C-alpha cells in the first residue's frame, strides 16, 4: 500500500532531520515491530511564551487512506487550549481535508503547525468553549491555566 510505503519514508526522513526538542516514533507492537499507522510524539513549548518548559504529548493516527486523507492528531483528553476538543483532537487547518491538507505535507510541517498553534489559537476554530471564552474575554485566567498546564507537562 502507498500508505505504509509513505510512512516508512516519513520515518526515514524524520529520524535524520527533525526540529530540535521534538520527538516522534511509531508505537511498538507485541512482537517488537512498529505500528507505522500510530505514532507518539512530543511538542516542546516555545521559549518566551507561557507554554515554555512543557513538552506536550500527542498521538498521530494515520488512516488507511493516508496520504490522500490527513492523519488525526490528538493531545490527551482534557488538554486545555481553544482549538482542542474535549477528546484531545486538535483542530488545525493543514489537518482538514476541506481546508489546507495536501498529500505532500510532512510530519515536520505538522508538528511545527501544532507548536505554532499553542501560543496563537485560530479564532475560526473554537473547539473548547471555556478555553476560547477565557482566551478571548478573561486573558488573566487563561494565562494562569496555561502556566499551570506547562508545569504539568514539564
Amino acid at each position: 500500500s502507498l500508505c505504509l510505503q509513505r510512512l516508512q519514508e516519513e520515518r526515514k526522513k524524520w529520524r535524520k532531520d527533525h526540529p530540535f526538542g521534538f520527538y516522534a516514533k511509531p508505537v511498538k507492537k507485541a512482537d517488537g515491530s512498529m505500528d507505522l499507522q500510530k505514532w507518539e510524539a512530543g511538542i516542546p513549548g516555545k521559549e518566551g511564551t507561557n507554554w515554555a518548559g512543557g513538552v506536550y504529548p500527542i498521538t498521530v493516527e494515520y488512516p488507511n487512506e493516508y496520504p490522500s486523507k490527513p492523519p488525526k492528531v490528538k493531545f490527551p483528553a482534557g488538554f486545555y487550549h481553544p482549538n482542542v476538543y474535549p477528546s484531545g483532537t486538535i483542530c488545525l487547518s493543514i489537518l482538514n481535508e476541506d481546508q489546507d491538507w495536501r498529500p505532500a505535507i510532512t510530519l515536520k510541517q505538522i508538528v511545527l503547525g501544532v507548536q505554532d498553534l499553542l501560543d496563537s489559537p485560530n479564532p475560526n476554530s473554537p473547539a473548547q468553549e471555556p478555553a476560547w471564552r477565557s482566551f478571548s474575554r478573561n486573558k488573566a485566567e487563561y494565562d494562569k491555566k496555561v502556566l499551570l498546564q506547562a508545569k504539568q507537562y514539564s
Binding site: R15, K16, D17, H18, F20, G21, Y23, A24, K25, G42
Partner: protein, 91 residues
C-alpha cells in the same frame, strides 16, 4: 576468427556492518561522531560534553525522547546511520 574472452567475476567488496554515524545536537551545535555499533555511548557523551564545555552530569541525552544510559550501545537501542541524539540541560 573471433577472439576468445576468458573472464572471472570479481565478488563485490563486502560492506562492513560495524560502525554508524550519529548526529548529536543541543539546539546550538550539531556534532557528528562515528562509533562502533557495539560500543557504549559513554565516550560519545563525554566527547560532546567537553566539546561544548559542560559537565557530563549537567546534560541528559535523549534518543527519540527516551533518556540514554551511558552504558547502552547503538545496537541496544536499534540506532541507525545518521540517527539523532538530543542533548538537553538536566532538570
Amino acid at each position: 576468427d573471433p577472439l576468445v574472452p576468458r573472464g572471472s567475476e570479481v565478488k563485490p567488496e563486502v560492506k562492513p556492518e560495524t560502525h554508524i554515524n550519529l548526529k548529536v545536537s543541543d539546539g546550538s551545535s550539531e556534532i557528528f561522531f562515528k562509533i562502533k555499533k557495539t560500543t557504549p555511548l559513554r565516550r560519545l557523551m563525554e566527547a560532546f560534553a567537553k566539546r561544548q564545555g559542560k559537565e557530563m552530569d549537567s546534560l541528559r541525552f535523549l534518543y527519540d525522547g527516551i533518556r540514554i544510559q551511558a552504558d547502552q550501545t547503538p545496537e541496544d537501542l536499534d540506532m541507525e546511520d545518521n540517527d539523532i541524539i538530543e542533548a538537553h540541560r538536566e532538570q
